[PDB]
Design a protein around this nucleic acid. Structure first.
Ligand code: K
Ligand code: K
Ligand code: K
Ligand code: K
Ligand code: K
Ligand code: K
Ligand code: K
Ligand code: K
Ligand code: K
Ligand code: K
Ligand code: K
Ligand code: K
Ligand code: K
Ligand code: MG
Ligand code: MG
Length: 1336
RNA sequence: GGGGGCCACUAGGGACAGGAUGUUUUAGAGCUAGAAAUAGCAAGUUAAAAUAAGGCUAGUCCGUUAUCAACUUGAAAAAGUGA
DNA sequence: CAATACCATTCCTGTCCATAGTGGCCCA
DNA sequence: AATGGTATTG
């Protein structure tokens, strides 16, 4: 008894089938367990496991980190209160108690209800004097009077609890005023450097134009307008853009070739300014210098909208400006609405439901929704011009705690905190002694390279302590080993050397590593001249000379420099042919040139004595990112360099690690020669062996030493699958697949199959699209977003996305495109889809007409390339197209598509090469084949074949075994079946293909062969004339029969027509969040759940809508009526995720607390979601919850109706042949009565199983309404009708324009008397429990 | 040789440190006319506190991923059970 | 009970590691 | 996006 298994692996399904020698599907009697009269059941060996998607760890991580943040913010406030403890006790012994209980209702408050002062008079007076916290902040910053300790606490606590960002390193407020004079001085330095061409900035109000509460680019335009001449793209224009964002290429300004750009915020700024001044002269330094100067007073102008000379609290002053303008404009708006349009006053100022001022202050209306609601009301009235200006600048009636405060750096809050401490430390000594402690509370962050401050109970932590004691912000440097922690941060994530698994890899930018890469590339270079008989390698002396002359004087070495600067200069060759490198060397000594610029001592770099030193420096610069730790670690070399060089040196940093270790590169030595790997790369006689040859050559000891160093370590199956690189979604399917194969082998008497054939399906976002387009267009300098505004959702249209990615132009022709005629344009595949089935934006292009591409059987013609290469390069530099898209677009200037390329593409269409599928194949193969032969080589009893979906897809379409995904879930199982059939047949016919399709170890010819690989199934083949194949197809050598075109197609038809298919929805305990996150207001309802143990929801609000982890069958008694008489019940109790641990720790106590008595402990049945019940007439239901059910039956629609629906709907495309198109159309029209028959099948199924009477009647009327519609559209909507019958949760669907809402099953009472069906993973093994036999 | 190193991209996974909103209860004396219903008017921008209930291992830690038919012997990990 | 309509905390900055898809040089 | 919780209407 031999058999094969077909598998179809998806993100929500694993289809499986078992086939025999004749491509038939067996059927067995399987024993049925339980307490029903049914002892067995006939099962076909085909089906599909269904499951909800596996989820990533992301959401869990975001929640975990936000938790840690709330905990540490609370601890910040706690530190502050601990500082204030005793002196506050002297002033007001219950202030902090009032703060802590501020949330409680007056009934529950232990102290007086007014938090700050504990009496209504003083509290009301406080709020009158200080309407916002920023009033109190500014007063405490500016005033000199002794202030009440409680108000001091309130100001400092507000600064510490909402402390601003940390994106800016260093200290702040160097220049806060005289921006007018700074701008005059920048204009002055420009005029000094260009005495012939000066700029007159007299009268230019640079303050108002540049500190304008508007975008930077707009201010640039205005300022350039004020200066006569001086176009925005001139030198001074880009220098104004310097304080603004882009500061684009000065190459236009200085006529230099390479691209320039600067950004005073980037830490590469000093190096880029050096790189530029080396190209143009240090005399321009004062030009950027002054620029930087003028920037300092203006960089914060967006945040500090008030002069910095009347207050030392410009931020809080700006908030008070917000408040005062809010008040003035509110008075004015109220008066206007009273006068002009008095009927709307109530809707604006009283209606929270509307988006007026009421809904904006008291309702749920946002600033944007309010601006939208009030725009027309302001335009409709008079005297609202200034208010409309403030509205379109987003500065009308602003609150102070707003979504856009995220740009406030922590240094500003710190400045105000320090100012207050300085004012009041004169009166309170404890503020003087704790000034720096409080400042530290504000300024302290745990470094990202330290992680959680755990003590052995966090699986996420790596930090090591210098001593065992509580870490505070003030003793962090002493208790936490920052260096060891920062090291472990990297070393717990980096790979070891695979060849020497106990050796760490080198920094990618190590000098040694780059010597290795350069010599490895260089040793395989060959050259030919005239007198030479044969191309020669480079000798060791030649490689040393090329490294010293070229690689050590140029960052990048081109083949041209090799030919002219070495072979002509040293070898006196006029002509030489180079192989092994094209255009320019890929490897390069970048770090060598970095350190040469920094230290300016070529002899120091070239001295081998300093090798180790340099290796450490780069190591440090790689291992650490914090400037102080880098500095401390380089301190040991402070004696070798000048302080200027030490500063420049600690400035420069590297990221990334190599893949080889130092011991591999320049450590282990060959026994005979005594040479390291690098020594052979530098010189290897006449062989010039490279790295691979070196570690594989049996005449050397490197291979032996690597073998010896290797250690094997073992993961479990689940651990192994978890550690694969793939989506957790597909990993869930992989593990399910292995469990399914295990059960299937158990079903077949523990006999292993002959073949296993596996196919694997191919595998918010609009925000990424909008980001791409914004960046690319502002990098392009285009005004397309100015002239055509767009929202992210709109970019989900392919053509509009392409339009914006193409700067609104045609990509094959130099002309504009029209947004409104997008429907008339074309979307063309760069490399045609007949070769590369790629439908992504990386291979698609928007053009006015695909006809202009040229011939349709290749990449675009050379004319197009010549015309459009520069435009495409612009788009590439804007990151609007990728390098792959650009290269494919330009392939015609590189010979176009060759015949080898087309052969390869067609092979790719058939031979799977994704790593993840290969891992699935390896897993199955290592589980199935476990014995070794006499030569100790693996015995492959089971052949694991992998196929791509296109094989079986083309099969289905060519032999009319059509699939319709919406009818039911049987297509996953059928895919599995057809995979088994096609794979086994394919390798039976052509055994030599095993190398390609089985796991384990003339271009026209392969093109033809792989295009016609599947023709042995067809009876006649039309290929560019008509050829004919026999009725029986056999193997050429063995003579064995592989395919009987008569009987075997009938076998396949019979298998696809079988109604009994084992579809199983995997039952799962629900996990995750306890409930919806919405904190709801107070309500008289027991559905509300307290947010804290003592916060009664009827007084405080809270949560509702909790998630049931799993239901539980309870057979017990419950008290009834005022008498409390015991009454026997049987019902489903939903155990929520939050209740689950309590219920499981002791089920009886939990249930008795819920109200039940005398619980029959042994009749408690755990019922996860999707638990299956059968009732009468085969009607099935699945548990959706403790109080709702899902549809549980599959509609086994016959194959003739399935194929009719496919053909009539024009599912996919029917264009194979004109005459075959005609035959399909004729069959559709001849069998048009199949529409009524299909409606009848749906109706019978619904009346037996679905039981949505009203919905079925509405659907029947809708079908009888559109009987005159074309057959195509009626079929297309009949497809939609199956949403009524599909398995799972009920859903709404549409028949033409009629909408059918979901009919829900909002009661679980009936399943309590039905038959509960427990199913194994395949559903072949069942345990059926009659629940009606359970009762009181 | 579907292994390896390098170059150029692109896409996804994982961890950590931080920012701003939002929400919820309370505080921010509402006034006047009327028995009330209600009407007319005034006012509004701020804060505290919580932000999974909570847990013990008590850390400036942990609490939403992965994994799960039933039954048996099992404390549990497990292993076994049916053409 | 049964049907029906509404509801669902959001967005952002920075540091770092690995894998794997495409094209290319050199090899096992 | 879905689909299970919830209140409202009977
Ligand atoms: K009280
Ligand atoms: K001008
Ligand atoms: K609001
Ligand atoms: K190259
Ligand atoms: K680094
Ligand atoms: K020195
Ligand atoms: K889920
Ligand atoms: K789960
Ligand atoms: K109030
Ligand atoms: K199951
Ligand atoms: K929000
Ligand atoms: K992030
Ligand atoms: K590659
Ligand atoms: Mg907490
Ligand atoms: Mg808040």
């Amino acid at each position: 008894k031999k058999y094969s298994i077909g598998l179809a692996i998806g993100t929500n399904s694993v289809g499986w089938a078992v086939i025999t020698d004749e491509y038939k599907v067996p059927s067995k009697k399987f024993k049925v367990l339980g307490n029903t009269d049914r002892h067995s059941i006939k099962k076909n060996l085909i089906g599909a496991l269904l499951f909800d998607s596996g989820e990533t760890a992301e959401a869990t991580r975001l929640k975990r980190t936000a938790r840690r943040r709330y905990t540490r913010r609370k601890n910040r406030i706690c530190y502050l209160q601990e500082i204030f403890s005793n002196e506050m006790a002297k002033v007001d012994d219950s202030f902090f108690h009032r703060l802590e209980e501020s949330f409680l209702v007056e009934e529950d408050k232990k102290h007086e209800r007014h938090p700050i002062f504990g009496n209504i008079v003083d509290e009301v007076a406080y709020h009158e004097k200080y309407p916002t916290i920023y009033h109190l902040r500014k007063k405490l910053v500016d005033s000199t009077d002794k202030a009440d300790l409680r108000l001091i606490y309130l100001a400092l606590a507000h600064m510490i609890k909402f402390r601003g960002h940390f994106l800016i390193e260093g200290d702040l407020n160097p220049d806060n005023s005289d921006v007018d004079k700074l701008f005059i001085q920048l204009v002055q330095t420009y005029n000094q450097l260009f005495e012939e061409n000066p700029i007159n900035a007299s009268g230019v109000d640079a303050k108002a134009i540049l500190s304008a509460r508007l975008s930077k680019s707009r201010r640039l335009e205005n300022l350039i307008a004020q200066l006569p001449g001086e176009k925005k793209n001139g030198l001074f224009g880009n220098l104004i853009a310097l304080s603004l964002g882009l500061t684009p290429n000065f190459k236009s300004n200085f006529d230099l070739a390479e691209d320039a750009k600067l950004q005073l915020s980037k830490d590469t700024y000093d190096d880029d300014l050096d790189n530029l001044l080396a190209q143009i002269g240090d005399q321009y330094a004062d030009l950027f210098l002054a620029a930087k100067n003028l920037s300092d007073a203006i960089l914060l102008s967006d945040i500090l909208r008030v002069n910095t000379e009347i207050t030392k609290a410009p931020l809080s002053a700006s908030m008070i400006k917000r408040y005062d303008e809010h008040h003035q404009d509110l008075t004015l708006l109220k008066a206007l609405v009273r006068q002009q349009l008095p009927e709307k006053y109530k809707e604006i100022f009283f209606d929270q439901s509307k988006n007026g001022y009421a809904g904006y202050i008291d309702g749920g209306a946002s600033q944007e929704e309010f601006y939208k609601f009030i725009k027309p009301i302001l335009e409709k009235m008079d005297g609202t011009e200034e208010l409309l200006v403030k509205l379109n600048r987003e500065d009308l009636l602003r609150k102070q705690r707003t979504f856009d405060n995220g740009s406030i750096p922590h240094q500003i809050h710190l400045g105000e905190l320090h100012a207050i401490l300085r004012r009041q430390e004169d009166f309170y000594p404890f503020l003087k002694d704790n000034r720096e402690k409080i400042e530290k509370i504000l300024t302290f962050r745990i470094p990202y390279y330290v992680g959680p401050l755990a003590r052995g109970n966090s699986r996420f932590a790596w930090m090591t302590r210098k001593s065992e004691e509580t870490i505070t912000p003030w003793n962090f440097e002493e208790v936490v080993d920052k260096g060891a922690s920062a090291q472990s941060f990297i070393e717990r994530m980096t790979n070891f050397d695979k060849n020497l698994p106990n050796e760490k890899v080198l920094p990618k930018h190590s000098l040694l590593y780059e010597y290795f890469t350069v010599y490895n590339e260089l040793t395989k270079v060959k050259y030919v001249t005239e007198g030479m008989r044969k191309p020669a390698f480079l000798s060791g002396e030649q490689k040393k000379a090329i490294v010293d002359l070229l690689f050590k004087t140029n960052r990048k070495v081109t083949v041209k420099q090799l030919k002219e600067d070495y072979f002509k200069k040293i070898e006196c060759f006029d002509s030489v042919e180079i192989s092994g490198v094209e255009d320019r060397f890929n490897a390069s000594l970048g770090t060598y040139h970095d350190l040469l610029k920094i230290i300016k001592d070529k002899d120091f770099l070239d001295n081998e004595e300093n090798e180790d030193i340099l290796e450490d420096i780069v190591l440090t610069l790689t291992l650490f990112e914090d400037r102080e730790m880098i500095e401390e670690r380089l301190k040991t070399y402070a004696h070798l360099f000048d302080d200027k060089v030490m500063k420049q040196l600690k400035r420069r940093r590297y990221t990334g690690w190599g893949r080889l270790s130092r011991k591999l590169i320049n450590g282990i030595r060959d026994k005979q020669s005594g040479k390291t790997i690098l020594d052979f790369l530098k010189s290897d006689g006449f062989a010039n062996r490279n790295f691979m040859q070196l570690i594989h050559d049996d005449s050397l000891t490197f291979k032996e030493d690597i073998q010896k160093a290797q250690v094997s370590g073992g993961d479990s199956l689940h651990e192994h699958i978890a550690n694969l690189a793939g989506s957790p979604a597909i990993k869930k399917g992989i593990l399910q697949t292995v469990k399914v194969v295990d059960e299937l082998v158990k079903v077949m008497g523990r006999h292993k199959p002959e073949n296993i054939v596996i196919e694997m399906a191919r595998e918010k976002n609009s925000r990424e699209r909008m980001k791409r387009i914004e960046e690319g267009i502002k990098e392009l300098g285009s005004q397309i977003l100015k002239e055509h505004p767009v929202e992210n959702t709109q970019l989900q249209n392919e053509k509009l996305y392409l339009y914006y990615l193409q700067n609104g132009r045609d990509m094959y022709v130099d002309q504009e495109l029209d947004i409104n005629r997008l429907s008339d344009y074309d979307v063309d595949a760069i490399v045609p889809q007949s070769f590369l089935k790629d439908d992504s934006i990386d291979n698609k292009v928007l053009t006015r007409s695909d006809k202009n591409r040229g011939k349709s059987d290749n990449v675009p013609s050379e004319e197009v390339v010549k015309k459009m290469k520069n435009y495409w390069r612009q788009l590439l530099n804007a990151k609007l197209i990728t390098q792959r898209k650009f290269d494919n677009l330009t392939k015609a200037e590189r010979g176009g598509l060759s015949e080898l390329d087309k052969a390869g593409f067609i092979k790719r269409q058939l031979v799977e090469t994704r790593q993840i599928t290969k891992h699935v194949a390896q897993i199955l193969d290592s589980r199935m084949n476990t014995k070794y032969d006499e030569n100790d080589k693996l015995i492959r009893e089971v052949k694991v074949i992998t196929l791509k979906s296109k094989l079986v897809s083309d099969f289905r379409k060519d032999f009319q075994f059509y699939k319709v995904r919406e009818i039911n879930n049987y297509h996953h199982a059928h895919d599995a079946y057809l995979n088994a059939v096609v794979g086994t047949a394919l390798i039976k016919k052509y055994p030599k293909l095993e190398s390609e399709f089985v796991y384990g170890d003339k271009a026209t010819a392969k093109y033809f062969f792989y295009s016609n690989i599947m023709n042995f199934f067809k009876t006649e083949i039309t290929l560019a004339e008509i050829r004919k194949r026999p009725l029986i197809e056999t193997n050429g050598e063995t003579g064995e029969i592989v395919w009987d075109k008569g009987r075997d197609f009938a076998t396949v038809r019979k298998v696809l027509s079988m109604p009994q298919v084992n579809i199983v929805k995997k039952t799962e305990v629900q996990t995750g969040g306890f409930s919806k996150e919405s904190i709801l207001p107070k309500r008289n309802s027991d559905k509300l759940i307290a947010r804290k143990k003592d916060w009664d929801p009827k007084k405080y609000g809270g949560f509702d809508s909790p998630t049931v982890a799993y239901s539980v069958l309870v057979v017990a008694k419950v008290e009834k009526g005022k008498s409390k008489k015991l009454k026997s019940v049987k019902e489903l109790l939903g155990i929520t995720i939050m209740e689950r641990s309590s219920f499981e720790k002791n089920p009886i106590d939990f249930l008795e607390a819920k109200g039940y008595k005398e619980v029959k402990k042994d009749l408690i049945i755990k019922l996860p979601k999707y638990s299956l019940f059968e009732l009468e007439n085969g009607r099935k239901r699945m548990l959706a919850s403790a109080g709702e059910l899902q549809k549980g039956n599959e509609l086994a629609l016959p194959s003739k109706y399935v194929n009719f629906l496919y053909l009539a709907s024009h599912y996919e495309k029917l264009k194979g042949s004109p005459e075959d198109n005609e035959q399909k159309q004729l069959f559709v029209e001849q069998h048009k009565h199949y529409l009524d028959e299909i409606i009848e099948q749906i109706s019978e199924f619904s009346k037996r199983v679905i039981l949505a009477d009203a919905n079925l009647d509405k659907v029947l009327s809708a079908y009888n309404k559109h009987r005159d519609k074309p057959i195509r559209e009626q079929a297309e909507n009949i497809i939609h009708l199956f949403t009524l019958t599909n398995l799972g949760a009920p859903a709404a669907f549409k028949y033409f324009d009629t909408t059918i809402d979901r009919k829900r099953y909002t009661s679980t009472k009936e399943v309590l008397d039905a038959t509960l069906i427990h199913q194994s993973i395949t559903g072949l093994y069942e345990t059926r429990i009659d629940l009606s036999q359970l009762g009181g």
